Design a protein around this ligand. Sequence first.
Ligand SMILES: [Mg+2]
Lengths: 99, 99
Amino acid sequence: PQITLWKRPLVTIKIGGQLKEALLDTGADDTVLEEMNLPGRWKPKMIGGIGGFIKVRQYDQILIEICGHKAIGTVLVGPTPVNIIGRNLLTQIGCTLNF
Amino acid sequence: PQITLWKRPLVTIKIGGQLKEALLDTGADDTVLEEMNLPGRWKPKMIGGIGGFIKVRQYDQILIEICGHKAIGTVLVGPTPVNIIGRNLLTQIGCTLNF
Ligand SMILES: [Mg+2]
């Protein structure tokens, strides 16, 4: 798709057998989603840093369908205020900024 | 341009007679830049909210050249950790997400 930016770029994602809403966020390095069950080995990761850090669980090689397009990559799971699709997965789906 | 997202989307901007670096940030509603002198009437604005608020100065109808393309819009000036080009100005330059 081509997505304009008058509104927050919220899209439907499919992940872990669930549907969720998430923000396409070019200002975020990583993808971080609300609590949910994902397969595989995870390890804790400290993210943020500006004001403090937040602990999340890092899951690698997770399949996601972001607005119809499939990708595999790292998904952090933990207490984020908004579900964020970060650059790691935006690149995997071939999402670019254009003007 | 077409900008991929392997790296942070930092671009050169021209504003207020100066050159600066800023991030093209689809996860930010507003444009917020480090301390600098801008023309016109400003008013304080509280931004953020997640953990607390930060006070910035709101300047309207400021001309900016974002990676070669001119736009006019609102620029918030204050103590941001990164210079951010938010959706308000991304829309003005016709920046879209595409995949
Ligand atoms: Mg951000």
